[PDB]
């Protein structure tokens, strides 16, 4: 939102107020409390007809500070609030001195300048990380509309770089982008977004979120260049400045401080596959599919059963087509004999020409305008009404429809929609509507998360959610929404994914071959790649189906190719999957978050790591070239074996059965013997690889279990020319191979063969030892 | 501007109509039109009750493709117009399909698909550079504000990036953001720009100029994120495609359509101070600042009068205020005795105070209001009139008034402001008013630049602009506007340098030190080190002074040092600087001009290319570290003569008489023999420097003239370990270094001395050949 | 209420939609319902993103033809209504075609076709009385006003005169009059009057009483000079046909519906 007219004005209309003195400074209990004076208020004859800031500083958890900047406290402040995790007795420092009032917390202190010359500094051990200037900061009063806005600017340095606000699609560093943060169904397209959150995070190790559900109008550099502006209609401003120094550290803080993702069923990353959407499908199709899978030798873990489930404008009403699947029960115990587990499309929604809709109107359970009537539109669905999930009544009805479809067999829910919730309502709880509008992403996916925590278990319960708000992230599996069928969508796409872990989220999917319209096989091709390699994979389309023989029978070979390398890969991969849940650190990470000290990685948003070692770079061209930066050190191809030198560009060209998959030195990397499905027992029969230890450096290797705790730890420590091998748990019949080792000099406790990749070495015990020439 | 609202929808109380189908082709001369339809016309009877758009394709230069959509052409459409170089004979070839219509020049090409697909593609020798989409385009009747525009949306490729748009301060890459342009005095600080330019280019080797000096709203990734975005109020649209295919390519082919920037005289390229601008200053003043200068041996080429030479509100009358300079004539020919060029601060304002208003409004030489009575306002000066330049007899006027100034001694003059032009008046000529905001800084900045040619000569002719529109890069001199002093407005500053020349301007400066505000010591000096290596040098504060011993006593050292090192420089500086007269090709590039191909140096924004061969990278921390990119090769500190392998990033630690400035590896390099001036005699004592000449390459470097033309070439060929030095022309007294070689072989036809540097050579030709020990 | 701006065009800032393509056809005891999509939903990717029209067709009396045509159904809706005497239990038969939905009661039916061309026909043994051609009935959103309506138009044979609409004292017969259905005190001198019923007969001996106290806005033969366009400020339209087939055996069923 404009505020300035350039650096000399102020937007016509506007009238600004700033803290610009202390006038007071007062500790109650735990908190700073700071009255500011937007003039010079030091003579008694200035300390009346004026307005004053209230400016109080806390801490909700270690390393974060709060700084909640008010006007009038009178104004009615209703909820929802975010669900945020607020401790009571944080440790914190005070001091108030002459020259200064700091608040301190862990390392990080919110520090602010008594005198003449006005200061809001935020520090780390004394160092400036961020903060507000003089005029930077205060109260708009807009008599152009006759709202009033609170806003701040925190100040960036040279070169620093702003990440996150949530799932988007623009161009990934935020610099000089404006972002609305409102949910909206907009596609993957535009610069609108599903999936929006107020927090950003920099290449200087701190986040901040703007602790206001309603809308907040960033500018990120882009009215003030080197500053990030955020407003918000209000009061009072509220914001929460969360210490790194990393960016992991930064979102360890914030998803404690939020809420940590929940980790996912480890059958959830096998490969799904949908009935797409307006396409034709019925129990026949189905069988055709599953059945088309198997005959080819692709590995198939989850189906999904798309709108068309229920009759043509009654959606969401949760009662299966008769003419189309006249035996539910039935259908669903053949599809699950096989193994399957079985996903249903849900929305918050629902069509006037359902004859469920009567009985939600007459007890009270949709959303309704102000004078009582129910609030009502015609799109997605004729007199399309919303489920009032702030209505404890209606949220069990809501609740009780799916229970029923669990007791049927059906195992997840994609969670469609939520974004285009209306502010012209009154909410059954007295909720504010501005602040509805994305907490009720939340609420609703919360609501269904709990209906599987009570009916399939904690451990089993996974959402395909398309919406979210702050907190959601705890109910994992989001994926990017309506993207296209070209190469320029897939980098939109995959931007969206890097931007959710940025923002807190740990797991992330998209349609591999794109949604809307239909690829060219090698889009198709070079997108499976890239989804296999996705934490979550799922293939969807919009109006035609996404199996691989749609496209051309190489497909098919890419679709086998790269579910079986995941599958293989799951013991590598649920690790990292429990460090998104324990830590926040998603699956797919931006390079700026694995190597936050390269300059290189600033602006890198066309490949990614999947979890601390491996480098994917998808390729987004028919004939196969591809460029991808690589960090300091020595690389290795996970499967073609080459080896490259980092701090450096390279070029390349891959088929399709190909893509840059690259492994960091002095790693250890558990494989598994299954290329099958993903969820076995991961520590017995266990490929573990490693790749170049470098003298005096140790390797470090957790295989989990099915919860994700680690089960079994080896170590390979490098010493001289002598590795030593010590591992610690539980684990059977598994083996090492020396990656791009062809001889050795020595081995005690165990024996050698020569494999294509390098030495395998099996072990006698768990304490072996290699001599290299 | 808002168009869509998301993939789905569109902005309320907008009605959109798209040319979806080719109706009919036809070619007339050398110029080929499409008449397409917004629905299906294949059926006579819908043939009638319709829109149709008329899409015009010509060429007005070799390798441009002009592209015309228009609905009505009824509309008054009256100038100014862009002072473009239209060409009527241009070879063109249009072919005319059952499948297609398309209009080449050169190697670009625009196809139209008939037929059900529309398509409209630029086609690079059968390629696809970008192009439009169906429904990508066409005619916005905007119902709320009842205005209509036209639109545009060009495709942009994975990994494509965008650059220039004008001087801008954002983020360099132009992704994401909106941009206006319509000139405005916003400081260096916001989105805002003084100098508006609808032409952008990208990494993929092509650029677009919309052909609108109206206000064009580009939506550069920020609305649809794979599209650039532009639009119009007008009943047509007109923009160019640009064929590179490398950004050089580009910026040639650009600047010979719209102009080519004038060669500034090579006394231009000195030391200029300034009085700055709200401080005290007289003739005393200013004696004490030259005699400072040459006391403490600080060479100064240039002298600048700020607003104060006029008496207080009288600004823009041109009459010496007679206390504080009694005798203007006398003080000036005293100054240039002691061989300074002077400079005058003008421009194209008045402010009521001043006894020559009322003779400008009874002339009627002011711009005036629809009804008669002056257009003022009180911004800048009191009761501020406008000079109307459209009026013929006010530009003699004004011209008149400035030969008046040279007669004196004024060598040249700072052409500042003439952004903030109003759109509520009528103009002498009456010229549509949105089109002159913007057309009026070119029109100003004209008629100054041709008194100067009038006067002192072409050759002679140079200025000092804050502002600018498409053509007034022919009117060289500008500078970065009023900046702050700190390294965050250091880096914006440098930003908009990049983005200038990105944009057709081959000369450029900024204020050395900071405008605004007084720098702390540290800063000033890392600002004089980017200063005395940028085109043009100057020193230049809003309240306090920029002469070095206002800040400490090394200061003094680091303007000295960097002053001779710019007068050395000057034999390869002003042929970089010819390089722009002919070529377009700015003498500060962005390091993706000059490394088109690597990827590497896409978001490159804090060190650029001084010329073809001069990396530099200014240091914006006080404790002097600084990380910056190198590409393929191997460089050579230019004094320091350390060298550094490409393709990487670098972190350095630089004291204030240093920073990186390196030299790529095969070049032959000219630095003169005197660091007392940047005018003198350039071929004669000559040193050459030879780095890092691989096997079977061969370095050339071209001395020049005054004028600008090769006076003398040096050809060094390395053929195996022998290297053939051959000169052309005329030069005298000339020495070759070779960098970094200690002891040689043979030497035919030279003597030799080491140097702390590497071998001096001196030649007894035209022809040596060396022999490698 | 003008809403046709000539045969080619629509009044400026007002949008309307249409039941044009038969969706589905349901048996709900005595009555029957069809939904109405305003544009060809045959595909399924048709089938979202648009409006959905929900008829339906009941009796309250023998010969007496309810037809209720509304778009949503959570409005207010409030009394009072008129006393209108409803049966439960009128003998009707309803038949669902390929071609046809038919709803008979007496000798009156109100028949719609499926498929690509939509007509609301209403038939006496078999014969059309009159009828709603496509796009004579629907929803229009006023822009300029923020308020919305519901319209039909009946069609008038060669030669059928229109009469009635309560105590008026213009021209006997109806065709070429608007009237507005609210009561009024403008004496005897003017289009006003003290006594308005939205009920009109014809001389072909059906009658039709549109169901809405609130003021009915009727174009008999005055917009569209062959129909009787009525349309009320609603998000339902309920509208009764009414047989004869003599004006007195209408005014007979008339009476025993509304009272005698």
């Given at each position: 939102m404009?505020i300035?007219?350039?650096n000399?004005?102020?937007?016509?209309?506007?009238?600004?107020?700033?803290?610009?003195?202390?006038?007071?400074?007062?500790?109650?209990?735990?908190?700073?409390?700071?009255?500011?004076?937007?003039?010079?208020v030091?003579?008694?004859?200035?300390?009346?007809d004026?307005?004053?800031f209230?400016?109080?500083?806390?801490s909700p958890?270690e390393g974060?500070?709060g700084?909640?900047?008010?006007?009038?406290?009178?104004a009615?402040?209703?909820?929802?609030?975010?669900?945020?995790?607020?401790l009571?007795?944080?440790?914190?420092?005070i001091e108030?001195?002459?020259?200064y009032?700091?608040?301190?917390?862990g390392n990080?202190?919110?520090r602010?300048?008594?005198?003449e010359f006005?200061?809001?500094d935020?520090?780390?051990n004394?160092?400036?990380?961020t903060?507000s200037q003089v005029?930077?900061?205060?109260?708009?009063q807009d008599?152009?509309?006759?709202?009033?806005?609170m806003?701040?600017?925190?100040?960036?340095?040279?070169?620093?770089?702003?990440?996150?606000?949530?799932?988007?699609f623009?161009?990934?560093?935020?610099?000089?982008?404006?972002?609305?943060?409102?949910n909206?169904?907009?596609?993957?397209?535009?610069?609108?977004?599903?999936?929006?959150?107020?927090?950003?995070?920099?290449?200087?190790?701190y986040?901040?979120?703007?602790?206001?559900p309603?809308?907040?109008?960033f500018?990120?550099?882009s009215?003030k260049?080197?500053?990030?502006?955020?407003?918000?209609?209000?009061?009072?401003l509220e914001?929460?400045?969360?210490?790194?120094?990393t960016?992991?550290?930064?979102?360890?803080?914030?998803?404690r401080?939020?809420?940590?993702?929940?980790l996912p069923?480890?059958?959830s990353?096998?490969?799904?596959?949908?009935?797409?959407f307006?396409?034709?499908?019925?129990?026949?199709?189905?069988?055709?599919?599953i059945?088309?899978m198997?005959?080819?030798?692709?590995?198939?873990?989850?189906?999904?059963f798309?709108?068309?489930?229920?009759?043509?404008?009654?959606?969401?009403?949760?009662?299966?087509?008769?003419?189309?699947?006249?035996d539910?029960?039935?259908?669903?115990?053949?599809?699950?004999?096989?193994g399957?587990?079985?996903?249903?499309w849900?929305?918050?929604?629902?069509?006037?020409?359902?004859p469920?809709?009567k009985?939600?109107q007459?007890?009270?359970?949709?959303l309704?305008?102000?004078?009582?009537?129910?609030?009502?539109?015609?799109?997605?669905?004729?007199?399309?009404?919303?489920?009032?999930?702030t209505?404890?009544?209606?949220?069990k009805?809501?609740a009780?429809k799916?229970?029923?479809?669990?007791?049927?067999?059906?195992?997840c829910?994609?969670?469609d929609?939520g974004?285009?919730?209306?502010?012209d309502?009154?909410?059954?709880?007295?909720?504010?509507?501005?602040?509805?509008?994305?907490?009720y992403?939340?609420?609703?996916?919360?609501?269904?998360?709990?209906?599987?925590?009570?009916?399939?278990g904690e451990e089993?319960?996974?959402?395909?959610?398309?919406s979210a708000?702050?907190?959601?992230?705890?109910?994992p599996v989001?994926?990017?929404?309506?993207?296209?069928?070209?190469?320029?969508?897939?980098?939109?796409?995959?931007?969206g994914?890097?931007?959710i872990?940025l923002?807190?989220?740990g797991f992330?999917?998209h349609?591999?071959?794109?949604?809307?319209?239909?690829?060219?096989?090698?889009?198709?091709k070079?997108?499976?790649?890239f989804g296999?390699?996705?934490?979550?994979?799922?293939?969807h389309?919009?109006?035609?189906?996404?199996?691989?023989?749609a496209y051309?029978d190489?497909?098919?070979?890419?679709?086998?190719?790269?579910?079986?390398?995941?599958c293989?890969m799951?013991?590598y991969?649920?690790?990292?999957?429990?460090?998104?849940n324990?830590?926040?650190?998603?699956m797919?990470?931006?390079?700026?978050?694995?190597?936050?000290d390269?300059?290189?990685?600033?602006?890198?948003?066309?490949?990614?790591?999947?979890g601390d070692?491996?480098?994917?770079?998808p390729?987004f061209?028919?004939?196969?070239?591809?460029?991808?930066y690589?960090?300091?050190?020595?690389?290795?191809h996970?499967?073609?074996?080459?080896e490259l030198?980092?701090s450096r560009?390279?070029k390349?060209?891959?088929?399709?059965?190909?893509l840059?998959?690259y492994?960091?030195d002095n790693?250890?990397l558990?494989?598994?013997n299954?290329?099958?499905r993903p969820?076995?027992?991961?520590?017995?029969g266990?490929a573990?690889?490693?790749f170049?230890?470098?003298?005096?450096?140790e390797?470090?290797?957790?295989?989990?279990?099915?919860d994700?705790?680690?089960?079994?730890?080896?170590?390979?420590?490098?010493?001289?020319n002598?590795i030593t091998?010590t591992?610690?748990?539980?684990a059977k019949?598994?083996?090492?191979c020396?990656?791009?080792?062809?001889?050795?000099?020595?081995?005690?406790?165990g024996?050698?063969?020569?494999?294509?990749?390098?030495?395998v070495?099996?072990?006698?015990?768990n304490?072996?030892?290699?001599?290299?020439?």
């Amino acid at each position: 939102m404009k505020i300035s007219d350039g650096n000399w004005l102020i937007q016509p209309g506007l009238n600004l107020i700033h803290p610009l003195q202390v006038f007071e400074v007062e500790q109650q209990d735990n908190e700073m409390v700071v009255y500011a004076a937007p003039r010079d208020v030091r003579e008694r004859t200035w300390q009346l007809d004026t307005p004053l800031f209230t400016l109080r500083f806390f801490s909700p958890q270690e390393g974060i500070v709060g700084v909640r900047i008010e006007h009038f406290q009178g104004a009615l402040n209703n909820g929802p609030h975010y669900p945020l995790n607020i401790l009571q007795d944080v440790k914190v420092t005070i001091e108030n001195t002459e020259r200064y009032a700091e608040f301190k917390s862990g390392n990080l202190s919110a520090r602010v300048s008594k005198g003449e010359f006005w200061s809001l500094d935020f520090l780390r051990n004394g160092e400036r990380i961020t903060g507000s200037q003089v005029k930077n900061n205060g109260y708009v009063q807009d008599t152009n509309n006759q709202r009033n806005y609170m806003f701040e600017r925190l100040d960036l340095g040279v070169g620093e770089t702003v990440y996150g606000l949530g799932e988007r699609f623009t161009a990934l560093v935020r610099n000089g982008q404006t972002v609305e943060t409102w949910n909206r169904d907009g596609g993957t397209s535009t610069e609108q977004a599903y999936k929006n959150i107020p927090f950003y995070m920099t290449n200087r190790g701190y986040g901040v979120l703007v602790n206001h559900p309603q809308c907040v109008s960033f500018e990120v550099g882009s009215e003030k260049v080197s500053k990030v502006q955020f407003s918000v209609e209000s009061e009072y401003l509220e914001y929460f400045v969360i210490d790194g120094p990393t960016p992991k550290a930064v979102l360890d803080r914030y998803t404690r401080f939020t809420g940590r993702p929940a980790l996912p069923p480890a059958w959830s990353f096998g490969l799904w596959l949908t009935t797409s959407f307006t396409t034709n499908y019925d129990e026949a199709t189905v069988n055709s599919f599953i059945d088309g899978m198997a005959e080819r030798n692709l590995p198939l873990h989850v189906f999904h059963f798309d709108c068309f489930w229920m009759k043509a404008f009654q959606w969401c009403d949760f009662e299966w087509d008769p003419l189309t699947f006249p035996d539910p029960e039935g259908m669903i115990r053949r599809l699950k004999a096989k193994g399957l587990k079985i996903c249903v499309w849900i929305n918050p929604y629902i069509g006037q020409k359902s004859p469920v809709f009567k009985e939600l109107q007459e007890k009270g359970y949709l959303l309704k305008r102000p004078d009582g009537s129910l609030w009502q539109w015609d799109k997605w669905q004729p007199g399309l009404a919303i489920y009032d999930f702030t209505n404890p009544d209606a949220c069990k009805w809501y609740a009780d429809k799916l229970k029923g479809l669990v007791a049927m067999g059906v195992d997840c829910f994609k969670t469609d929609f939520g974004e285009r919730i209306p502010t012209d309502v009154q909410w059954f709880d007295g909720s504010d509507p501005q602040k509805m509008h994305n907490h009720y992403a939340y609420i609703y996916n919360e609501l269904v998360w709990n209906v599987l925590k009570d009916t399939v278990g904690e451990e089993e319960a996974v959402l395909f959610a398309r919406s979210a708000s702050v907190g959601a992230q705890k109910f994992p599996v989001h994926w990017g929404g309506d993207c296209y069928a070209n190469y320029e969508s897939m980098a939109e796409s995959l931007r969206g994914g890097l931007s959710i872990g940025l923002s807190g989220f740990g797991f992330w999917s998209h349609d591999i071959g794109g949604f809307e319209n239909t690829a060219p096989a090698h889009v198709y091709k070079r997108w499976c790649a890239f989804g296999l390699l996705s934490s979550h994979s799922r293939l969807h389309g919009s109006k035609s189906y996404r199996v691989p023989w749609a496209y051309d029978d190489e497909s098919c070979d890419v679709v086998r190719f790269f579910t079986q390398l995941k599958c293989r890969m799951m013991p590598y991969l649920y690790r990292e999957a429990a460090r998104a849940n324990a830590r926040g650190t998603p699956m797919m990470r931006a390079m700026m978050m694995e190597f936050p000290d390269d300059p290189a990685c600033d602006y890198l948003d066309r490949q990614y790591m999947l979890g601390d070692n491996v480098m994917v770079a998808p390729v987004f061209t028919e004939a196969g070239d591809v460029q991808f930066y690589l960090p300091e050190g020595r690389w290795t191809h996970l499967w073609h074996n080459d080896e490259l030198d980092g701090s450096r560009w390279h070029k390349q060209q891959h088929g399709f059965l190909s893509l840059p998959v690259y492994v960091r030195d002095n790693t250890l990397l558990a494989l598994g013997n299954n290329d099958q499905r993903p969820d076995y027992v991961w520590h017995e029969g266990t490929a573990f690889h490693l790749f170049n230890l470098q003298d005096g450096h140790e390797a470090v290797c957790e295989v989990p279990a099915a919860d994700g705790s680690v089960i079994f730890t080896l170590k390979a420590a490098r010493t001289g020319n002598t590795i030593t091998v010590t591992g610690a748990g539980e684990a059977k019949n598994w083996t090492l191979c020396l990656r791009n080792v062809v001889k050795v000099n020595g081995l005690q406790d165990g024996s050698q063969a020569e494999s294509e990749q390098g030495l395998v070495v099996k072990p006698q015990g768990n304490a072996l030892t290699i001599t290299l020439h």
